[PDB]
Ligand binder design. Structure first.
Ligand SMILES: NC[C@H]1O[C@H](O[C@H]2[C@H](O)[C@@H](O[C@H]3O[C@H](CO)[C@@H](O)[C@H](N)[C@H]3O)[C@H](N)C[C@@H]2N)[C@H](O)[C@@H](O)[C@@H]1O
Ligand SMILES: Nc1nc2c(ncn2[C@@H]2O[C@H](COP(=O)(O)OP(=O)(O)NP(=O)(O)O)[C@@H](O)[C@H]2O)c(=O)[nH]1
Ligand SMILES: [Cl-]
Ligand SMILES: [Mg+2]
Ligand SMILES: [Mg+2]
Length: 292
């Protein structure tokens, strides 16, 4: 019953809000999300690594997007250094999964793909001046993360681990995939964030918590992912073709680079948050990838 505490905080911070019911519907490792009154999502976090940007982004998009695809619309927010809460009406629907996709008719699949493409085209096309502050430079961030590695645990890594990192840094230095179009991206655009209605059409998109002005290629990273969690490379390829005017080969390169980085990102997260578990997981993942 983290629930009782959160109920207290909600009713305390939002003057006239009454919690008749509240259950946990999702949990990150940093955050917890709650379904309140079978109607409202409350996303909450205990510590500037908070929800101010995410709020600015919903507000920018609800103002500027013209689409029937629903996104969170923030009605309640409390933002402080130690605690952030965002409340919005739950988008209703079913989350896309590989299993579900595989039961869809070819036409249903095509329409879903089209809807996705169309959403991304609209969002990426937005004049982002009003949120110009929300920029993200992935290359620079990785360079800074590498420095942090060097200043902390690098020297205690194994040769195999070092070689995996250095081989990645060499690739990062040689790639051209950061030199293209920048635009506003969702930046965590995977199928556990996509909602379907009863006709298997795209009805909503959630979790713009990593969104920012970044490489156009970023929003295809999970659509191109080949894994148990995602639909598959062909799904992303097809979506890229529908989206148009984008170098597919570079999109795939970008995805492949971000996937190579994942275990390192996992390690860095563990260092930054003082969680050994993640440091260990990421190093182990390097070995699993090395021996594939
Ligand atoms: N779990 C196993 C899988 O993990 C990654 O893919 C998943 C990402 O981790 C998720 O994103 C999360 O992690 C990111 C940093 O990695 C964060 O930025 C983001 N805020 C988080 O929601 C994303 N939404 C779905 C995607 N399938 C690897 O690519 C994949 O090979 C591996 O099989
Ligand atoms: N049906 C539905 N579920 C939602 C909605 N918003 C959030 N959820 C559920 O709550 C979970 C957590 O939401 P999400 O924004 O992805 O937060 P997070 O990834 O756990 N936290 P963070 O983005 O800070 O890392 C989602 O995976 C989903 O299960 C919504 O509007 N509709
Ligand atoms: Cl370790
Ligand atoms: Mg999420
Ligand atoms: Mg998120």
């Amino acid at each position: 019953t983290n629930v009782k505490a959160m109920k207290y905080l909600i009713e305390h911070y939002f003057d006239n809000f009454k919690v008749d019911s509240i259950e946990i519907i999702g949990s990150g490792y940093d955050s917890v999300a709650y379904l309140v009154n079978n109607e409202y999502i409350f996303k909450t976090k205990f510590s500037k690594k908070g929800y101010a940007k995410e709020k600015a982004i919903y507000n920018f998009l609800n103002t500027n997007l013209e689409t029937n695809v629903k996104i969170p619309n923030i009605e309640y927010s409390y933002i402080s250094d130690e605690l952030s809460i965002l409340g919005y009406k739950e988008i209703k629907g079913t989350f896309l999964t590989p299993e579900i996709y595989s039961t869809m008719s070819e036409e249903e699949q095509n329409l879903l793909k089209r809807d996705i493409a169309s959403f991304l085209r609209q969002m990426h096309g937005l004049d982002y001046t009003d949120i110009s502050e929300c920029t993200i430079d992935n290359k620079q961030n990785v360079l800074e993360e590498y420095i942090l590695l060097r200043e902390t645990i690098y020297n205690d890594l194994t040769d195999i681990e070092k070689d995996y990192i250095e081989s990645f840094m060499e690739r990062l230095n040689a790639t051209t995939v950061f030199e293209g179009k920048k635009c506003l991206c969702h930046n965590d655009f995977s199928c556990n964030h996509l909602l379907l209605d009863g006709n298997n059409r795209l009805t909503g998109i959630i979790d713009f918590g990593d969104s920012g002005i970044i490489d156009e290629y970023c929003d295809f990273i999970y659509l191109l992912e080949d894994s148990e969690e995602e639909i598959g490379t062909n799904f992303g390829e097809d979506i890229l073709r529908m989206y148009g005017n984008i170098d597919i080969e570079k999109a795939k390169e970008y995805q492949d680079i971000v996937e190579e980085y994942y275990p390192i990102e996992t390690i860095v997260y563990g260092i930054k948050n003082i969680k050994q578990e993640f440091i260990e997981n990421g190093r182990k993942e390097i070995y699993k990838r090395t021996y594939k």
